[PDB]
Enzyme design. Sequence first.
Site, PDB file in Angstrom:
ATOM      1  N   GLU A   1      47.336  44.412  64.917  1.00 48.63           N
ATOM      2  CA  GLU A   1      48.008  44.893  63.700  1.00 48.63           C
ATOM      3  C   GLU A   1      48.169  46.421  63.789  1.00 48.63           C
ATOM      4  O   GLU A   1      47.189  47.127  64.025  1.00 48.63           O
ATOM      5  CB  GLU A   1      47.220  44.518  62.431  1.00 48.63           C
ATOM      6  CG  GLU A   1      46.280  43.336  62.583  1.00 48.63           C
ATOM      7  CD  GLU A   1      44.934  43.501  61.906  1.00 48.63           C
ATOM      8  OE1 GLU A   1      44.263  42.472  61.666  1.00 48.63           O
ATOM      9  OE2 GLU A   1      44.548  44.655  61.609  1.00 48.63           O
ATOM     10  N   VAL A   2      49.404  46.923  63.606  1.00 48.30           N
ATOM     11  CA  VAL A   2      49.740  48.349  63.702  1.00 48.30           C
ATOM     12  C   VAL A   2      49.788  49.016  62.325  1.00 48.30           C
ATOM     13  O   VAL A   2      50.625  48.653  61.498  1.00 48.30           O
ATOM     14  CB  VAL A   2      51.051  48.586  64.500  1.00 48.30           C
ATOM     15  CG1 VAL A   2      51.203  50.059  64.866  1.00 48.30           C
ATOM     16  CG2 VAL A   2      51.116  47.706  65.751  1.00 48.30           C
TER      17      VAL A   2
ATOM     18  N   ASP B   1      59.164  43.067  78.166  1.00 50.58           N
ATOM     19  CA  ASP B   1      59.520  42.627  76.795  1.00 50.58           C
ATOM     20  C   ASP B   1      60.609  43.499  76.084  1.00 50.58           C
ATOM     21  O   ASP B   1      60.491  43.749  74.880  1.00 50.58           O
ATOM     22  CB  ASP B   1      58.211  42.544  75.948  1.00 50.58           C
ATOM     23  CG  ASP B   1      58.229  41.818  74.603  1.00 50.58           C
ATOM     24  OD1 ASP B   1      59.136  40.977  74.385  1.00 50.58           O
ATOM     25  OD2 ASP B   1      57.286  42.040  73.794  1.00 50.58           O
TER      26      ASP B   1
END
Lengths: 255, 255
Positions: B21-22, B135
């Site tokens: 989680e950022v 990605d």
Amino acid sequence: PSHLSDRYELGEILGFGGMSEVHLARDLRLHRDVAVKVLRADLARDPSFYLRFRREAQNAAALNHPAIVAVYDTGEAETPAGPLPYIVMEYVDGVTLRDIVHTEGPMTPKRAIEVIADACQALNFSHQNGIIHRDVKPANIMISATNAVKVMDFGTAQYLSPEQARGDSVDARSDVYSLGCVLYEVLTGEPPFTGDSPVSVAYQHVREDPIPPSARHEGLSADLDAVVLKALAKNPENRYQTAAEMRADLVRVHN
Amino acid sequence: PSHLSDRYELGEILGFGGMSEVHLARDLRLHRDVAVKVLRADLARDPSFYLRFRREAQNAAALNHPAIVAVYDTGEAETPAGPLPYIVMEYVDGVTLRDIVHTEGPMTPKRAIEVIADACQALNFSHQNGIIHRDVKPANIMISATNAVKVMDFGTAQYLSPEQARGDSVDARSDVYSLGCVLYEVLTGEPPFTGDSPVSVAYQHVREDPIPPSARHEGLSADLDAVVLKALAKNPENRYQTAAEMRADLVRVHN
Ligand SMILES: NS(=O)(=O)c1ccc(-c2ncc(Cl)c(Nc3cc(C4CC4)[nH]n3)n2)s1
Ligand SMILES: NS(=O)(=O)c1ccc(-c2ncc(Cl)c(Nc3cc(C4CC4)[nH]n3)n2)s1
């Protein structure tokens, strides 16, 4: 000590000064080479010096630009002597303009324009974030192993602005003048003014007009002379008002 | 917790994912806004996940480029639940290409070229330092408040390379293709292939040729079509061999 906070394996001294010594270290947690600036330890046991070092870190951390050497971490080392403050910074594997001018001589006009034009960008960003460098000199501009321009010391009588020499107020124009002295040096191989004493140099900056670059070193365009002598103008109103203004004029001589 | 290692005052969630989680936080020691990536805490009590998070930090710390979001610090938080690993990163006050495409629609050709050309630079540096992104997608390219291009996640079926879709080996060309899908999306407002299932999209990437951009969205030069369709070539030998090669071709269409 060997390892600062048991994470920064200190190595060779890259340089030293009056208050702080700059080492090359390895951040063990991240597996990367970093430049670690450490306080004299004897100055660390003083509230006047500690305030100056901790605020030097905060001012430098406030600027995130590719031409400005980055601050990564800050802290204190567990020595029996007392708490040892340190700043962890971006490692730039390079050489200063001072080293280049002294060992390889002046730069080709086109490379000197490319270097100082990139330095203008770093300074204009600083000014935009309300910080005036106060110490632009060849020793504070490095050239990376990737040939990138990197500026340090955000926060010597030869590269003073007349206002600094007179002990008056400073702004972005004081940095423009100082950068003009650097551009003059990388072009001709000599600073604009030299004398046996620092006062002999301070006076020249205030009263004596600068010798044109084309006259000191051969094969320098009158286009460059006009740019250099504009940055070197005695009145700050007559100089470039921003470092962006200076880059714009340099970019034109180059093309 | 409130403050990580009594130094990082956590704030609003900027985004979340499967493992990490950022958050947006404030480094109290340096007085600066930072982006702090924290592990799920339940995954922190696992040796397989901890190894992946600590190495993710080390791989990202290995790249120092202006178009790549910087790693500043790493550590662990003193929670009663267990040690909580975290990565302290450069805060980019901006929006993703995903947000821009979804809310403002496609970009003007000239702005889309400027954005993807800058992204090529970040990727070519990564490849030069032996790291393949793996990605590339609109969600991993941000645009700064200063309009700067910033790439994250160094170390979704719509933006896969055919080799990724086939589960084969990957290289710089796999990133070039993936970036081609991003350039296609910011230009036309749609990805090159879409289907009701991920396998429907994977198959299209492998067998179905791409619809030219000029045909999907009006007012797109046949010069751009040739660049986009070259990055989108099915065989990696037929694509641009480097991201530098792609930027060079984009720079030409623009001029
Ligand atoms: N500050 S000083 O002692 O005058 C001094 C003069 C020259 C210095 C120097 N020389 C060679 C290299 Cl390879 C190098 N790398 C650095 C240095 C820094 C500094 C900002 C923390 N980051 N990366 N630095 S250090
Ligand atoms: N990683 S994510 O959750 O997909 C995600 C998607 C979008 C994110 C986002 N949105 C808005 C802002 Cl202002 C922002 N600032 C950041 C973010 C980072 C990241 C590298 C550590 N540095 N600076 N980030 S975070």
